[PDB]
Amino acid sequence: RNKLAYNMGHYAGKATIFGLAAWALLA
Numbered sequence: 001r002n003k004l005a006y007n008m009g010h011y012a013g014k015a016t017i018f019g020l021a022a023w024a025l026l027a
Helices: 008-024
Strands: none
Touching: none
């Protein structure tokens, strides 16, 4: 039931900086 510019778009920012760092840089 959750979705919003802050949900998707804002998390996309976090996930690309943090999450992706684990995958790109850390893996």
